[PDB]
Write a protein that binds this ligand. Sequence first.
Ligand SMILES: O[C@@H]1[C@@H](O)[C@H](O[C@@H]2CO[C@@H](O[C@@H]3CO[C@@H](O)[C@H](O)[C@H]3O)[C@H](O)[C@H]2O)OC[C@H]1O
Length: 324
Amino acid sequence: TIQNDIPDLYSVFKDYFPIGVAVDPSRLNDADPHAQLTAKHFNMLVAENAMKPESLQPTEGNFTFDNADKIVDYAIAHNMKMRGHTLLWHNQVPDWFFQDPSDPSKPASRDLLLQRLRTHITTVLDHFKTKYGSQNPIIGWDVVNAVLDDNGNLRNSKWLQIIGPDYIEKAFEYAHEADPSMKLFINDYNIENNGVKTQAMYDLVKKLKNEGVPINGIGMQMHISINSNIDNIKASIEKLASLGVEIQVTELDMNMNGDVSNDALLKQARLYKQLFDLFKAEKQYITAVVFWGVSDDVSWLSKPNAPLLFDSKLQAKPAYWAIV
Ligand SMILES: O[C@@H]1[C@@H](O)[C@H](O[C@@H]2CO[C@@H](O[C@@H]3CO[C@@H](O)[C@H](O)[C@H]3O)[C@H](O)[C@H]2O)OC[C@H]1O
């Protein structure tokens, strides 16, 4: 059971930006405590998995939008906005995309993979536009996800192998043509550490935007840890924001590195407080902050963990009170 009388999390940030959460379609029933927590504290939703490529087109031409639509319906019912995650990634994408259909032992050509990407992106965006119309809660999409490797080079996924470096520009082009009302984002992790990957994201977006690619913003996943440096996060936000794009904190959670002790929870609270003070200070750039999971018990991180503001019993943690 949840705490019904404590402050609604997102309301505390009404003058800064919406506060969202990533959800599972199986946790949306009115009597489900996770759903109650979702509707109470957030005014933005994201599909943790239901809108990924494999979740939308498991086999070629066979689109499965039921779970995604269930989340969209829920968002509409609770007056929540949504982020679309994600049109392209190297994980949770079916092998068929990259295979020659007449000889699955061979790879698809650059033209065939591009056509498939175009069809996927266009069908996905057209689905939400045609089914929901003006009521579509999705305000933007992570057009490409995690396209950089640890060293800042372009990740050598099958997309890069088969098409080449311009597959990124093509994805944005296809999304923009399908629905110009959508804000288009390039999303990634570790770009908040002000290291080589932050610089690489900055260089890539600067290059593409200067070439006319319709990139509207950068999503900083923010899968931080109990040892993350606030100064580096601030420097990263400033650097990326200098490109004239929106910044959204898209998959916020805190890896405790196995230490879920009471002392660690207090340290977590202090860090989350500093983090949100930073976000508020940077409100002229940040247009959304989304947590990757409703509560600790449903977090994607391996156990033991305590990454969010609500614990495994769905109760507000010290971090929640520090921020509110
Ligand atoms: O942007 C990335 C996120 O999308 C990513 O989210 C996690 C992706 O893996 C999910 O776990 C899979 C769910 O589907 C099952 O069939 C698989 O067996 C699981 O591995 C997890 O639920 C998401 O939270 O996190 C990393 C980000 O870079």
